[PDB]
Amino acid sequence: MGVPSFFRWLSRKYPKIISPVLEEQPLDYSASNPNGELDNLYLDMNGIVHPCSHPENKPPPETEDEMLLAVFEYTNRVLNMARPRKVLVMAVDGVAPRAKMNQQRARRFRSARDAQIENESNAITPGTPFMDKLAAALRYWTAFKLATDPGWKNLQVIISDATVPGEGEHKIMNFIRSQRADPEYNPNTTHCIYGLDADLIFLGLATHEPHFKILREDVFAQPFLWLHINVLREYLSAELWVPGLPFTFDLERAIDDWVFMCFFCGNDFLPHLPCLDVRENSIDILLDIWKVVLPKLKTYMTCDGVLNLPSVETLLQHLGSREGDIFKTRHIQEAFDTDEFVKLFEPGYHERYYTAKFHVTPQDIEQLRKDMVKCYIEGVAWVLMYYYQGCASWNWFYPYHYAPLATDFHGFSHLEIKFEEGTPFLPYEQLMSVLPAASGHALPKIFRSLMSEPDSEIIDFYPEEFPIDMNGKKMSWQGIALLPFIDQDRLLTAVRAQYPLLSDAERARNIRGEPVLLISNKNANYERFSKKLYSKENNNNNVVVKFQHFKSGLSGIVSKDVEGFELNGKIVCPLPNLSTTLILKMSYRLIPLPSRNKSIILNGFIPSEPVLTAYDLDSIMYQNIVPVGPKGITQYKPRTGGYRAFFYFAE
Amino acid sequence: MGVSANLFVKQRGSTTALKQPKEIGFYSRTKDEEYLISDDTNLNYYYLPDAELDRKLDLSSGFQKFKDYYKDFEDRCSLRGLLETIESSERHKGKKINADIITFRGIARKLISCAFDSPSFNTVDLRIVSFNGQLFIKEVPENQDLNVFTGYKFETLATLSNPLQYTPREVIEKRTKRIVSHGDEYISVVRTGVGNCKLILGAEVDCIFDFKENGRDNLKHYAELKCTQQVANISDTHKFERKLFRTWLQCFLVGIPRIIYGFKDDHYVLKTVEEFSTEEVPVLLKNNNPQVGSACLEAIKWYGLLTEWLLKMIPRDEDPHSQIRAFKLVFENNHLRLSEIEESDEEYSGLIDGEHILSNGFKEWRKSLK
Ligand SMILES: [Mg+2]
C-alpha cells in the first residue's frame, strides 16, 4: 500500500525521531556509519516474504527458486546496513491465536475473490510446501555465512521457522522479554527491529528497553530510515505531563497507558469503535480525555499489562459525552455488497444503529449490548495481555462483526477476567481454518475435498461467494467480509478424522516441531557446547545445557538437533557448506520467565545524550544523524548538591 | 608485665602495595545473634533509578519505629562467625590457612587511621589481642542518633532483599514505608596481605550490584553505600574529601570496587547520588586536594610498618596450638600506639585464657585437632 497518513502524523508531532540510514558504496566487521553499533537484530520476516511474492514494482519473480534468491539478496542488504555484533533472530511467522485467525481469514477469502477477477499469494501461510521450502533454504544461507565470513566468527543466529507456533511479532517479544529476565543481562545492549508494520513503534515502547531502533523503507524517499525509540520517550516526557496528580508521576506507567490508548483506538483483532475511525486523527482525542480524567483516578490505568476497569469506565463515559459531536463534525467535514447506511447517527443513535447493523428487534437490544460490551472489554484485556506478558488464550475471539457505541460502555467495572493457555492448532487445522477453497491445492488434497465437495459436514465454512460490507464512505478495497464464524469443535473433529489416511511424510510438517534453532562457528561457547551435546555420554539426547548472558551476550537452554545433524557432517543447498570443520547447531529454548515482567528501567541503564531542547518541549507544552549507546559511566544525572556535580555546575 | 612495647604513630615503612585479595567464604547474622555460615539471606541487591532523585524522599521518615537490635546484643563485637567460617573453609581441605592475623575490617581501618586522625575525633577504642599459633584481634565495645538512622534508611531505600528481576512490584511500591533495622548483616571473609604479612579480614558489605555467582568470589560485584551529607560550598569539598578518604581504605583493604554517596539538602531531604570506582579516588584526590591524596601510599607504607611491628613486638608464633597462650591490651595514646601483656593476676587475663570471651571453644578444638 501507499505511504499511510500515520507517518505524516508521526513527522508532524515527533520530527526528530527519524534519521536516514548512512550507507556505503564487502567486509562485514568494519565499524558502521550510523552513529552506533547493534548487539541484537530482530526480523519481521513476512515483511520481506510478501514484497518478494507480490512486489509493488512491476516485475514479479517467476519461480519459488527466484523468490528465495530475491529473499537472500534483500537480507544480505539488511545485515550489511545494520551489522549485528552478538545475535540475530529470524522469527518466521507461525500458527496464530483464534482472535488473529478470524481476522486473517477474511483478508484471505477476499484475496481469492480478487483472484476470480484476475483470471478474467496464499501460499505464504504456515504449513505450506512453500514455507517448508523457505525453512530449509534460510537455514542453509545462514550456515553458509557463519562458515565462510570471518566477521561473524563471534555471532549467534536464532531461527524460528513457520513450524514453531505463535505470530512472529509475538515470538520476538517473548525472546526480548526472556533475555531481559536474566540476572546477567547487560542493561545497555543495543537493539534493532526490521519490519514494515506501524505497530512496531508501540511494541518498542512496550519492552522498556530505551536503546531500541526501528528500521524501515520510506515509501516516498531505495533509501531507508531509522526511527529511534530513545528519542520518542524523550518526546513523550513532555507530551504526557499532567500537573497536580494525587499519586506520584512515573514515565514508564504513563507510556504504558499511552501505548494502551494506541492499541484501543485502532487494532488488529477487534473492530474499531464507530466514533474512532483511524489512529492518526484519534489518539490525541483520547489523550486529551486522559489528561482531563487522570487527577480523579486512584492510579494510572494500566499496570504491567493488567487493566483497571473502574478507571476505564470514566474515560469511556467522557468519550460517550463527545461521541455525538464527533459524528456531527465528521459529516460536516464532507463539504454481494451491503454498504448502505444513509440513516447516519443523529436519529436515535444506538436505538436505530443496532437494528440497522445486526437485524435484531428493539426489545432485545439491552441484552445484546450488555453481552457485546462484556466481549469487547475482554478483548481489550486479552490484547493488552498479549503484548505485555504473552497470549492469555489461543482459543478466545470476539463474537461479532461490529463494535458497541461509546454510550454503551458502563456497568462492566464489577467484572473480573479469566483465561486458559489451551494449546494452539496444528498446521493443517490452521490451514483449514483460513483458506478459501480456491487455494485448497496448498493442502494434501484429501483435506481439500472437505472445502469443496457437496457431501462435506463443514461446507458452511467455505462459501464460494459471500456478503461484503463497506463503511464510512470507503469507496475502496476496504469492505468487511461477513463470513460465518467457525465452530472450532465442528472443524477440528472434521479435520482430525482425516489424519490416519495421511502419509508419514504428511504427518511431518503437521507435527508441532516446536524447537527454535541456534547456530555457532568457533564461538566463545563452541567447545563447551560440542563437548556435552555432540561428544555426549548418550546417543539419545537427554543431555541439555542452560547458559547465561554474560559470556556471549545471549542466554537460553540448548540441546542436539532433531534434524540428523552430526559434528563431522557436511551439507548441500536445496554450494556445499563443509560444516564438518566449521559449524555446530542446536535445538534452542527460551529460559521461562521467573515471574511476571515489570514495566521498569533495569538497574545499570545509562542514557544516551539528550536530543530535544527547551524550544521543542515548550512547543509541545503549548534534526540530523543522532548518537546511540550509553553516554559514559555514571548512572545518575549531575544535579545541584553533589561533589562531582559541583565542579561540573561551576564549568 | 611479661612483655610491653610502644610504636610512634608518625614513623613509616617502605612496601608500595598490598597483595591481591581473595574471598574465602561468608556469613550472615540474624536479628537474634544467630550466625549463619555459608548463607546469604541478608545480602541486599542495589536498586534506585535516576528518576527516584526527582521525588522528595525523606531520610528521617520512620525514625520513631527504628528497630536498633544491635544495642541489645550480648557480645557486640563477637568474632564467632568469622572463626566458624574459617573452620568451615579449613575442614574440607585438611590444613591450616596460612594467614598471620585474623580480624575485622573495622579494626584494621581503625588501626591504619591512627596515622592521620587524633584519638578523640577518631574515637580510637581499646583493643585486645591474643595468639594460638597465629594472631587474633578484637575491639572492646564502647540528634546524633538521627544522623546514624539516616544512613540505615538510605541503605534501605536504595536496595531490595532479593534480585530486581525476582521482586514482585508491590514490594517496590511499599519500600518508602518499610521498617528500618540495624544489627542484621551480611559479612564476607577476605584473604589479603601487605608486604610479607598475610591476613584474613571479616567485612560487612551492603549490597551486590550485577548478580550473584554461585561458588565463586563475588567480590568484584559488591558496593559500599555511604551515609549521606550535603555538599554546596567550597569547604564542604574538603569535609567530603576526608570522608571519601576514610571510605577508600574501607573498600581498598578488601578490593571492593564501587563507592556510592547520597547527598542530603537539609533536614533529611535526599537531593542527589554520585558514584566512584575505588581506583579513581586516589587520582581524584591527587587532583583536587594533594595533601589528602598523598595520604594513600603513606597509609599503605604505615600499614606495612604496623604489621611488621605487630609481628616483631614480642608476639608468639609458637605453632603447636596445644601450647600455653598470651593475651594483650592495645591502645593509641599521645601519638604512641601501646601494647601490654594482660597478666594472669587480672580477671580479664584469666577470662580470655580460660573462656570463650575472645576465641570460641569449637574453633580452639578444631585447631587442636590438626
Ligand atoms: Mg554502606
Curated annotation (Swiss-Prot), chain A:
Keywords: Coiled coil, Exonuclease, Hydrolase, mRNA processing, Nuclease, Nucleus, Phosphoprotein, Repeat, rRNA processing, Transcription, Transcription regulation, Transcription termination. The keyword Ribosomal protein does not apply. CDD domains: PIN_XRN1-2-like (cd18673). It is found in: Nucleus. GO terms for cellular component: Las1 complex; mitochondrion; nucleus; RNA polymerase II termination complex. Its cofactor is Mg(2+); Mn(2+). The keyword Ligase does not apply. GO terms for biological process: cleavage in ITS2 between 5.8S rRNA and LSU-rRNA of tricistronic rRNA transcript (SSU-rRNA, 5.8S rRNA, LSU-rRNA); mRNA splicing, via spliceosome; NAD-cap decapping; negative regulation of transcription elongation by RNA polymerase II; nuclear mRNA surveillance; nuclear polyadenylation-dependent rRNA catabolic process; nuclear-transcribed mRNA catabolic process; positive regulation of termination of RNA polymerase II transcription. Optimum pH is 8.0-8.8. Its EC number is 3.1.13.-. Disulfide bonds: none annotated. Inhibited by nucleoside 3', 5'-bisphosphates. GO terms for molecular function: 5'-3' RNA exonuclease activity; mRNA binding; RNA binding; rRNA binding. Possesses 5'->3' exoribonuclease activity. Required for the processing of nuclear mRNA, rRNA and small nucleolar RNA (snoRNA) precursors. May promote termination of transcription by RNA polymerase II via the recruitment of 3'-end processing factors to the poly(A) site and by the degradation of nascent RNA downstream of the poly(A) site. Belongs to the 5'-3' exonuclease family. XRN2/RAT1 subfamily. Present with 623 molecules/cell in log phase SD medium. Interacts with RAI1 and RTT103. This is 5'-3' exoribonuclease 2. The lineage of its organism: Eukaryota, Fungi, Dikarya, Ascomycota, Saccharomycotina.
From Swiss-Prot, chain B:
Its EC number is 3.6.1.-. Substrate binds at residues 204, 226, 250. It is found in: Nucleus. Divalent metal cation. It comes from the Eukaryota. Its cofactor is a divalent metal cation. It catalyses: a 5'-end NAD(+)-phospho-ribonucleoside in mRNA + H2O = a 5'-end phospho-ribonucleoside in mRNA + NAD(+) + H(+); a 5'-end (N(7)-methyl 5'-triphosphoguanosine)-ribonucleoside-ribonucleotide in mRNA + H2O = a (N(7)-methyl 5'-triphosphoguanosine)-nucleoside + a 5'-end phospho-ribonucleoside in mRNA + H(+); a 5'-end triphospho-ribonucleoside in mRNA + H2O = a 5'-end phospho-ribonucleoside in mRNA + diphosphate + H(+). The keyword Mitochondrion does not apply. Belongs to the DXO/Dom3Z family. This is Decapping nuclease RAI1.
